[PDB]
Design a protein around this ligand. Structure first.
Ligand SMILES: NS(=O)(=O)c1c(F)c(F)c(N2CCCCC2)c(F)c1F
Ligand SMILES: [Zn+2]
Length: 258
């Protein structure tokens, strides 16, 4: 692929093939809490996911994804800034090379060790993910900052699955899993209009960033980093990091629900 996270093909370089990299609505961002606007029009976030929609886990080379069946509204996000319900299609993580960075969003400059993204597409307005992905109101992503500390037992099925998808392109069934079990117990959030955080970088995402972090151990983060970006048979190339730097707000307002 034309892009990665390496020195040559990584975030610093994306704008060459994806000029939107320098756009006005790029993600992730640093959330400065003294510049947020508390907003009473927001509703609470409501997730209702059906574990029967979990489908597959797959190694996509720069990361791994857990995908869900998205042919109907069995698993949905509602509330917050939204009037439409958004259909779950995937979750995945971002991490860094050491515990000291790795999240995509930061809060008052503080970097967390990893970030969970639970991604959804607007099935009220669009008929598929590929249609929704380029639309300003097409995607809703919950970002959960992950703070290195106590092992998180809720990650267990995900981590136990990685041994079946060690190298790029490997897929496996991943069933009977409700990813709302990964969310923090408080769903207070910030929201802002932004983008996908890697190519094609479309400015189609309403971000929902949880105020409360969830934990992850140093050894759990190691399991992410020991996934391999090469295909089976080649020299092992671990996936050490896949977070993008924070981008300029360019005048957007981050709103707080709390
Ligand atoms: N890290 S993220 O949550 O911002 C994110 C995402 F959720 C996506 F679905 C995609 N897409 C989905 C639409 C087409 C393929 C890639 C993407 F690029 C991406 F960066
Ligand atoms: Zn992501």
């Amino acid at each position: 692929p034309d892009w990665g996270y390496d020195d040559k093909n990584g975030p610093e370089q994306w704008s060459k093939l994806y000029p939107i990299a320098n756009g006005n609505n790029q993600s992730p961002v640093d959330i400065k809490t003294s510049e947020t606007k508390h907003d009473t029009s927001l509703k609470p976030i409501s997730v209702s996911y059906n574990p029967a929609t979990a489908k597959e886990i797959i190694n996509v080379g720069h990361s791994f994804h857990v995908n869900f069946e998205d042919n109907d509204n069995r698993s949905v996000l509602k509330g917050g800034p939204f009037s439409d319900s958004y259909r779950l299609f995937q979750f995945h993580f971002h991490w860094g090379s050491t515990n000291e960075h790795g999240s995509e969003h930061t809060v008052d400059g503080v970097k967390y060790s990893a970030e969970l993204h639970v991604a959804h597409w607007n099935s009220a307005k669009y008929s598929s993910l590929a249609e929704a992905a380029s639309k300003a109101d097409g995607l809703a992503v919950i970002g959960v900052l992950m703070k290195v500390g106590e092992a998180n037992p809720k990650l267990q099925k995900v981590l136990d699955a990685l041994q079946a998808i060690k190298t790029k392109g490997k897929r496996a069934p991943f069933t009977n899993f409700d990813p709302s079990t990964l969310l923090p117990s408080s769903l207070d959030f910030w929201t802002y209009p932004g983008s996908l955080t890697h190519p094609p970088l479309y400015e189609s995402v309403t971000w929902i960033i949880c105020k409360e972090s969830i934990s992850v151990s140093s050894e759990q983060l190691a399991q992410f980093r020991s996934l391999l970006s090469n295909v089976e048979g080649d020299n092992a190339v671990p996936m050490q990091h896949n977070n993008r730097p924070t981008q300029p707000l360019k005048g957007r307002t981050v709103r707080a629900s709390f």
